[PDB]
Design a protein around this nucleic acid. Structure first.
Ligand SMILES: [Mg+2]
Lengths: 405, 558
DNA sequence: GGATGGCGCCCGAACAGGGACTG
DNA sequence: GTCCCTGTTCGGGCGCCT
């Protein structure tokens, strides 16, 4: 029907060759049911082993619904795919709803010479059957080029709704449409349903955001009426590290209290110049980090520190000690706490903020073993995008720097 | 015959050309067996005679089959494989009998002449050229080319397995409740039908495959239990592995140990208690397969207790999805673990072991978490779900570990079982400084050029000590200083170090390490009643980190 | 003796990432 | 920049199944 648009790879980059990881039974049954309905409608086609490219695939079951959503880990293909202002007002609306408009990508076909790179393999339980491979015929969901090729047709659809509602910011990223407004709770949902009906006239979610409540977690210092040598030693080391971020932090008068070879439990009375030095340092940590400018041509790095008791701290930056945001993320403090389940929820909220504030996914440094993460992270995922990550063994020093009392 | 299925388009790598290798001499016995195969395949259209218009050639050779009577025609396509395109293998794993569900009727039949019944891409057949001699001076050598899949080509396994799935697709779509386990040309067929109605469905499968040029000879058509399938024996209600015969030399070499460990790993799937740590330790640093190595005393002891396990009867059962999956892990020493998966008590589905030594420093709780993950991933492949665990670790011991451990670690639904040796933490670092304990300020320093260093400490009670080191690093001196503080302190001690490298190792609470120095530190930490470890930034003048830094830097720095 | 593919195990080798160090 | 230490991935051998 509609003419195709040629899309090629980057210079000197072959297609993706990532092996499929084991899927559970209920996920394979859902993918088989989805792929058959996608094949009946010409969206995918069977291919053989002469296609040397492959991309993993799985499925997620949204909260309260008997419907599964096919997810293709296309971020290795996006890195190899050949390469609109970001709305600054989205992070200031009272409420923001995220719509899954990934179905709209099936109306546009895909470049014939590019289809071989979008291959995936459906495994079988207990290896009853060799892997059944497919490839895409239309714009795949979760691919970098899908919203770009569809950008022309997307603006045609949303234009009358954008004009009728000028106080509503609608930003698109991957298969998601972020809609924010200042309307009251109720009229906002009524306006979201207006868009859903307007989007169903052409062809063919969760949960509810509030960027007004996104606060930062600044570096805080302990407040005591009785200080020991250990308390001052831990404080001096924390300020010495914090001075890398805030150059105004000084530690001269606090260090002279520790002259000699003292016991850790010896109580040290704070002098006036030392007590004043601790007061000036608290005000410096309140000031924002000076000289930090968002570079779109570099990755967003996101570190996460497990603080225990359901507390999780994170920092977004591009250069060392040049943080763009330092926040925290707390959940339930029960006894049946799932660390992995809480960590995946953290990386989804952190990624969601990056897509809202800067319109890009961050690269996560995860404090978890590689084998532990890949075994259980797909069971708790709920987003249509997937950020890139690496695994690290953090020092327990950074854990104490962004700590909380 | 030949399958009327469409071929798979194959190309060479860009800029490459077909192979040109001359045939090596062959045994008279192999020449007489290769001609009868080729004269018959030439009639069936599976190979075609070529002339001087084909400049390519590739050697051939023949080996005996598992049937041990007939001959198998192989081709040394090592050169063509290097120049052929890349494939994506469709065989994602090996089926296991523990994942089979109980069926009312079972059939195991194979396809005859599997590869040679699947056509090869016409544009690629010229590269598969080979030459076969004969009785010299009485008839020269004939040159054929492959019209079907050759045995020795890189793409033959993937193309056959893919074409086999396309052929079985209409039968599976029509008979969705007939389970067909498909490994190469072997076909395990199960059904919930009466034996009379099941054998009818089998002929429908044989007629469907015959329609696609795949014959199922009666010689490989098993109809009664036990069924020989994938190296097992399938009885109506239980399965077992085919007999495993361990080698029994007296001058064990590397190649002999490599196949003894390989058979023990294969045996551990149903034989519980297999341990291969000491045997695998011998193979370190070797160079050749013929390199002889004498067994150690622990290796003789480990091999003996393994031989006793195999002289015992054992079997597995079949999977019942209406019940739970239960995995029970048992600990062995030196970082070895064994597990047993079952649904009913003492009716194992399968067993296994885990002994992968990860990390330079670790403890039992880390290794137990790693075994839980390997079993969970392995269970998702065989059964598609996660099992419930029975671990030999206290609830409090786990709650303590993931409380202090800075990394996210989680174990699925489990319960504690009292099967010693239990998994425990051999020591706990204090969270606050110890009152009444001597405060040690430790530090180490080393010179990069001369490899000389010094490790020592100063205490708040006036004591100080300095130890000189040779052939050391800056990290080792920091560890040597912490070991020196533990040696000369009481049962309760506070240590202050400036090395976040050494602090990070000790906080993880290891009980075993590749480093003997770290092992000596671990032994000291177990004997202590209370230990508190603080950290201060080095070269910042903090005391008494300054007094010890000036002491160890004297003579090796600045 | 002389082939290929899958999966498993174990090992040593070649990387990458972070921290500390010389003057 | 270099040296050190630790991590993961890769391919070698063996085991098992045209
Ligand atoms: Mg030091």
């Amino acid at each position: 029907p509609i003419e195709t648009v040629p899309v090629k790879l980057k210079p000197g980059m072959d297609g993706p060759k990532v092996k499929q990881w084991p899927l559970t039974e209920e996920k394979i049954k859902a993918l088989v049911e989805i792929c058959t309905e996608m094949e009946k409608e010409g969206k995918i086609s069977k291919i053989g082993p002469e296609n040397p490219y492959n991309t993993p695939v799985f499925a997620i079951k949204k909260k309260d619904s008997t419907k599964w959503r096919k997810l293709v880990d296309f971020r290795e293909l996006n890195k190899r795919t050949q390469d609109i202002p970001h709305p600054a007002g989205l992070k200031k609306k009272k409420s923001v709803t995220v719509l899954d408009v990934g179905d709209a990508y099936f109306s546009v076909p895909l470049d014939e010479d590019f289809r071989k790179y979008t291959a995936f393999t459906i495994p079988s339980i207990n290896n009853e059957t060799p892997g059944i491979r497919y490839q895409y015929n239309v714009l795949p969901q979760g691919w970098k080029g899908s919203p770009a090729i569809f950008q022309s047709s997307m603006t045609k659809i949303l234009e009358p709704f954008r004009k009728q509602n000028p106080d509503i910011v609608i930003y698109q990223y991957m298969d998601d449409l972020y809609v924010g407004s200042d309307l009251e709770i109720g009229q906002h949902r009524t306006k979201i349903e207006e868009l859903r009906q307007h989007l169903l006239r052409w062809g063919l979610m969760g949960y509810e955001l509030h960027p007004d409540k996104w606060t930062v977690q600044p570096i805080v210092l302990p407040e005591k009426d009785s200080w020991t040598v250990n308390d001052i030693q831990k404080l001096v080391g924390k300020l010495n590290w914090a001075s890398q971020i805030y150059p105004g932090i000084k530690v001269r008068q606090l260090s002279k209290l520790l002259r000699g070879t003292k016991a850790l439990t010896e109580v040290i009375p704070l002098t006036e110049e030392a007590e004043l030095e601790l007061a000036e340092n608290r005000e410096i940590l309140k000031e924002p980090v000076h000289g930090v400018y968002y570079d779109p041509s570099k990755d967003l790095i996101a570190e996460i520190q497990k603080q225990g008791q359901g507390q999780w701290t994170y920092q977004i930056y591009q250069e060392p000690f040049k943080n763009l945001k330092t926040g925290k993320y707390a959940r339930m403090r029960g006894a049946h706490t799932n660390d992995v389940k809480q960590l995946t929820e953290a990386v989804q909220k952190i990624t969601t903020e990056s897509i809202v504030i800067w319109g890009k996914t961050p690269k996560f440094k995860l404090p978890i073993q590689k084998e532990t993460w890949e075994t259980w992270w797909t069971e708790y995922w709920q987003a249509t995008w997937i950020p890139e990550w690496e695994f690290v063994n953090t020092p327990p020093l950074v854990k104490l720097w962004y700590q909380l009392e | 015959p030949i399958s009327p299925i469409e071929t798979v388009p194959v190309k060479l790598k860009p800029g490459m050309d077909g192979p040109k290798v001359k045939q090596w001499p062959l045994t008279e016995e192999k020449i007489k067996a290769l001609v009868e195969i080729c004269t018959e395949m030439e009639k069936e259209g599976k190979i075609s005679k070529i002339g001087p218009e084909n400049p390519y050639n590739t050697p051939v050779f023949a080996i005996k089959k598992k049937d041990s009577t007939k001959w198998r025609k192989l081709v040394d396509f090592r050169e063509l494989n290097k120049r052929t395109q890349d494939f994506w293998e469709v065989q994602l794993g090996i089926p296991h009998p523990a994942g089979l569900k109980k069926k009312k009727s079972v059939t195991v039949l194979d396809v005859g002449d599997a590869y040679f019944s699947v056509p090869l891409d016409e544009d690629f057949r010229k590269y598969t050229a080979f030459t076969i001699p004969s009785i010299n001076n009485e008839t020269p050598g004939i040159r054929y080319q492959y019209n079907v899949l050759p045995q020795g080509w890189k793409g033959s396994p993937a193309i056959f397995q893919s074409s086999m799935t396309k052929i079985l697709e209409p039968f599976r779509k029509q008979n969705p409740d007939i389970v067909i386990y498909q490994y190469m040309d072997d076909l395990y067929v199960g059904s919930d039908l009466e034996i009379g109605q099941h054998r009818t469905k089998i002929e429908e499968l044989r007629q469907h495959l015959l329609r696609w040029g795949l014959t199922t000879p009666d010689k490989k058509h098993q109809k009664e239990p036990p069924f020989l399938w994938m190296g097992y024996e399938l009885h109506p209600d239980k399965w077992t592995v085919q007999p495993i015969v361990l080698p029994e030399k007296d001058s064990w070499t590397v190649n002999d140990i490599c196949k003894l460990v390989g058979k023990l790993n294969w045996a551990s799937q149903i034989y519980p208690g297999i341990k291969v740590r000491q045997l695998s330790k011998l193979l370190r640093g070797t160079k050749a397969l013929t390199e002889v190595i004498p067994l150690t005393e622990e290796a003789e002891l480990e091999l003996a207790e393994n031989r006793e396990i195999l002289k015992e009867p054992v079997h597995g059962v079949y999977y019942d999805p209406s019940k739970d999956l239960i995995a029970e892990i048992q600990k062995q020493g030196q970082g070895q673990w064994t597990y047993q998966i079952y649904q009913e008590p003492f009716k194992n589905l399968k067993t296994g072991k885990y002994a992968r030594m990860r990390g330079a420093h670790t403890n039992d709780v880390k290794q137990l978490t790693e075994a839980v993950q390997k079993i969970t991933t392995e269970s998702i492949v065989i059964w598609g779900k996660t099992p419930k665990f029975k671990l030999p670790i206290q609830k409090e011991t786990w709650e303590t570990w993931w409380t202090e451990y800075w990394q996210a670690t989680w174990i699925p639904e489990w319960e504690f079982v009292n099967t010693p040796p239990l998994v425990k933490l051999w020591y706990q670092l204090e969270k606050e400084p110890i009152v009444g304990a001597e405060t040690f300020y430790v530090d180490g320093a080393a010179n990069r050029e001369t490899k000389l260093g010094k490790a020592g400490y100063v205490t708040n009670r006036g004591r100080q000590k300095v130890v000189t080191l040779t052939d050391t690093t800056n990290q080792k001196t920091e560890l040597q200083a912490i070991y020196l503080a533990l040696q000369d302190s009481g049962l309760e001690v506070n240590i202050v170090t400036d090395s976040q490298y050494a602090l990070g190792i000790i906080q993880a609470q290891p009980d075993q390490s590749e480093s003997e120095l770290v092992n000596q530190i671990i032994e000291q930490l177990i004997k202590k009643e209370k230990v508190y470890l603080a950290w201060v930034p080095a070269h910042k003048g903090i005391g008494g980190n300054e007094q010890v830094d000036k002491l160890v830097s004297a003579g090796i720095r600045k």
